[PDB]
RNA sequence: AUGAUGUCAUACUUAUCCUGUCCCUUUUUUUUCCA
């Protein structure tokens, strides 16, 4: 369900909280699964602060729900990898 | 690949030298011996050595891993 | 800029591990030192093969699957095949007729038979070694048929009890010139069942 | 000279054309030889580079790095080129772009750290008296950046010499603009200089010049905002002439004095703030009729600041300010401007939260019944926000009935698609709670009257109101009324419009969720045969709401519908899985799991095994997902012999479906599937040994999800057994299968451990082939990035070679 | 046509100066 | 910018162009890009002064970017076609009259006017078939063309035929060698080129719906105009391959 | 899938093997 | 902001607390040289670490601050440091709020083999031992009670040795608690040979003469 | 003996996604003719 392009930031996560839209709600932010969503998503930057306020960290809809890492990704601890909010390049 | 992964410790390719990989492995081993509390205690209580002297020896061995390069 | 195979044989302790093209590497001594350990694996030979990995079989057919013993003891295959053959003999008119009016009884045998097949009748399979490399073959070389040891068919058809009829000839010839490292127990090296030597 | 300029051009082309390591080396060489080349050609090559418009963002960032390193390595060597750097970076100091303004502030900080603040003060001393407004504002921005770079008292005696002097009012205006910009830039850093800034600005605060007095009041307001909440005794020097200036100043000076009074009012003493609020509220009542839009916005901001200011009581405010506020500011002209309407709504919500929302509700109940649609929607949104803030406890029953009649009139004249007033309707009625039980039947009768409309959207909005109000209807548990409305909606179920049908279906979803189980009329066996041809509709919202209602029914009520009808519903859902919405397919999977929990897992698994091999199209991954849910909710030990026998079908897609359902099921169950690893071993081995590499890709997904699932349970021997096929299968070509190989390798390195992965990678990274060695090196680099912790312990023993010491004596030094 | 011959006019303009009307960027009430 | 009048103010005796007296000065980046464009043109020396060709391209009042039409004329001829093109692309009002309603009739006439190789050849066919058509209003009515602006374009064509002895360029033509005509067009249009992206401005391109090549987005296209209305639009495009693009201004061109 | 033993040719569709009827060249090569 | 380069590598560093607690400086330790300097116009006061009077240890082991603790009063702060021998040397601060001038490092008490030492107030001084007993000490004197010599940073020398500060008596403070730690437990021998309710486990541990076998029996 | 290689159709992958665009104004040099 992923793409070879569209890297997000690869920048270390801070206090700006991730946020999911309805069009891709419930999926994981990394492997897009639905099994035990464990860890809150932090998006490291002005990915939340400013123009993209309350927006999707995935495709681009109106962000309504807190984005979660799943327990399968936090088994290898992919939650510390950084910002998953997509910046188009 | 990724730019941050290239900036991360452990980036290597087929063009990476064996001596450079061994130097990076020795630097990572010195960093792991500095970080581990049990391994540093085992390295310090082996002889009549101080903890600050062992830390200075580890800081010297970090540069000594790149000390005699190719 | 590089040494030959005889110089690599003199320099390294494992001259058989020195490959033909590994001496053309940037660090052939480091490659030989890495390959000299007992916990190393080779490169799969598709890098040397023009044919791709598991693609060029192209003229054979294989059986699809063999079920494990607990699954065959539960026996889902018989009424599954009966249902599949009944569906094949059904027309498509009968197919949406049975769609709009369904019927009972798919299998409905029990639950604890399948539960015991999964747990109590569970058998661990023969998992191979850490250093196994699979290729186009890698499922057929099971003879290592020991050298100096006969087979079960040779024990049965020639009347050899667990005494071969060629045992005196093998002991008179001693070690054979084909396999000088072969051991023939009972005639040459004084051995249970088919494998009567090593 | 010429050779130095040629070397400067060579380093510039190496920075702008070579590799970024070569650019960093050229920047290091420029920082080394800045004293050799001089700041002359350095400035004469940097100012064309700063003036180049087509430079890249990375190019100007590297230019900022080079200028910072050259300034650190040269310091006062660019002292004659202070004026050239100032005239280059004065557009950069007044840059409208935020990143360019930050880079200009960093360049100004570098220039202040290198050359010195005295040269910049001598440069800006003739520019302090700039009568031109744009030139004076550029000088104000540059002097604010210089004051932030060099601190307050580096230029505070110079500012006290300039601003207190009466040389020109333009110089005074520019200096007070410098003071206000520096206070806005500093914020909390102007707190120790609060009395100094008050003494500096007290001379211009009573100036006869209107612009100088206006910028002095603006700087006083900016200082009161910046030093919040310190410097109250510093700002109390101009406390007494502020009340006199509220009566003396007119126009823009009056607005600046009112803004300074509103900024100094929450930092004052409570008796003093009460006396000043009582003094200035009479002027603010006269300031309610300000015809200017910016002046009215400033007055409304002052009203919001006075509402946020404590110590001004509540009864005095509600008696004095609020009926002129509703007379003047609550008007259609203020509501038409959307910034003014939003500011008016926020100020009214803040005032209602400060002094009770009952007064605002009683003053806006008629404006909710006003005939203007956008004005009434803004009023109803304000009443909804006030009810969400305070509550309905302060609302009397007659005022609540009047508000109910007003919002029912608003729903009558709700011409637009205004769901915000529907949400406000639900908010006010939910805040009423159990008090709407007298209000229930006339509201229900009017909604049923609107449900007889010619217009589809009117009945659609009425059904949406039913969906919003089902919960608050069942709060008092009006079971007979809820059953009667369920029977009426059961009659309404034959609607020919899809949006109306979806709204009706969502209303029924809410009603079934709020009634209780044994208390709806008609019951579940009297409803699901009616619901059965509804699922044959082709509209997406109807399908989504009907599948959600079937999910709630098959979740709760399995005890009314025969399993024949349940698998007929499954037969319908097999055709319904080809819908475009992944949420619809996911809820279809959920209904399949509910029906498998209800009726038993045999016939539904036989049906899905028939369907999955028969689909073979751009679907059926959801069929594998549904098969995984049927297994996982209902004990996959039963399901696994049937799926294992269905793997033996040679039909070229059923094996891919078996493996996809296996991967999804292992990901769903996690650690409970440790006993089935021996069962899934030979099928995964045969799929990895299969000639069709899509089967090997999906088996790699199986291995990845199993390594995700049962890590820490002794399955590493079977994981290594499957990895004995996976690691030979690293010769893949397609991106999908090589991503599956990478994910399975990451999962196996997580599962078994880093030592076996290092034993695999170290024997392949030294390959003579560049591509194979680079691929194994990338795999090893990914494994080391994942497992850099235990890699030192898992590193093999290597002796010290002739290059450096490699046999580590730290391992030998063991206590 | 060469590389440094296209920058002597920019060097002369940098030595002369920059006028506020020469590229008047409209910006007011900045914060 | 000042791309039409920098050449004229240079040829009317002013070398201190940015030091020249005015009410307000122009932006210096416009002057710098005009001078660097003139460096990429064959109009300025290394000292930034007009040549004989730089004076002769100011004899005629068209833009220098459209005077490299004339400078590529008589290089390998095709002069008449590109001189007609340089006349008709100097129009003020836009070509083609597509009103409210009708639509499909004007579209079908315009599609009949379409030729591959950009809309310059399309409107060149418009002017070519308007020649030997009596120069009638009935032609432009039935072909949905404004009969006010392209009459001024044939007047510009008459004037530029008259103003040819001062630059000493004949009215040669290659007689249907329109790929060589496009070679001269590309010899003119080297600064305004693009690969779905402009290679100089680094902007993602968008093709106008009124262009003749709105469909079939190419690997290499030049353009004439950079007007943003809703998107970063490409106005008056032409198909290229960046072969003879590398021939003209090689100092401007590097790394494909 | 369909296998042509006269060519050792894979076929995903039956029409691929039906059109595979070069086939006679490799058939005559295997006949030798 | 600041970058002070040192040719000698910094094994450890102790920072003087700025403001009213003293200068805003740091003392980088080396072999018999604690360079105290501040970020600004301050002198690099190289306080020599006071060696023992006729020390029997070889001079290859340079005296460096293995454990350092700044025990601060209401105004000033003393610095207790342990050398390569590990003796507790209390150091004053005669900086006089201008530059680092004098740090009167006098060996106030002889200290045992301690991995770390932290000296709080109200009679609290916890010295964690690498081998042996970790010592919690209560203050008796003012901390400057040194029976050994004083090596100040402003005290001149011949640039070859320091003040010959031999092993002094513990006059500044008294170790009120000595909690014995089994680490580093090298050898072990657990048996029920002794008459006890549980078996005696003898863990042989410690370094050199500061080494013992602790036999523990429970019940 | 299995490689290179052509846009040839069919297959499959991706819980891939169900799809967007027509400009306000505006000025720019020079030469012959029959009873
Ligand atoms: Zn995940
Ligand atoms: Zn989304
Ligand atoms: Zn980010």
Numbering used by the authors:
A (entry chain D): 3 to 91
B (entry chain B): 10 to 16, 18 to 80
C (entry chain E): 458 to 601, 604 to 621, 629 to 656, 682 to 689
D (entry chain C): 490 to 1304
E (entry chain G): 160 to 190
F (entry chain N): 759 to 953, 959 to 1019
G (entry chain I): 53 to 73, 77 to 87
H (entry chain A): 223 to 441
Please quote the authors directly.
After identifying the IBC as a complex that delivers Aquarius to the spliceosome, we reconstituted the BAQR spliceosome on MINX pre-mRNA in HeLa nuclear extracts supplemented with IBC carrying the dominant-negative Aquarius mutant K829A (IBC(K829A)). We reconstructed a cryo-EM map of the BAQR core complex at about 2.9 Å resolution. This result indicates that BAQR is an intermediate spliceosome stalled after the translocation of PRP2 but before the action of Aquarius. Aquarius binds the intron at position −40 to −33 upstream of BS-A in C complexes. Despite the moderate resolution around Aquarius (around 6.2 Å), a comparison between BAQR and C complexes showed a repositioning of the helicase, which suggests how it might operate. Arrested between the action of the two helicases, the BAQR structure revealed how PRP2 operates at the Bact-to-BAQR transition and implicates Aquarius as the helicase that promotes the conversion of BAQR to B*. Finally, Aquarius enables the dissociation of PRP2, plus the SF3A and SF3B complexes, which promotes the relocation of the branch duplex for catalysis.
Here the inactivation of Aquarius leads to the stalling of a spliceosome intermediate—the BAQR complex—found halfway through the catalytic activation process.
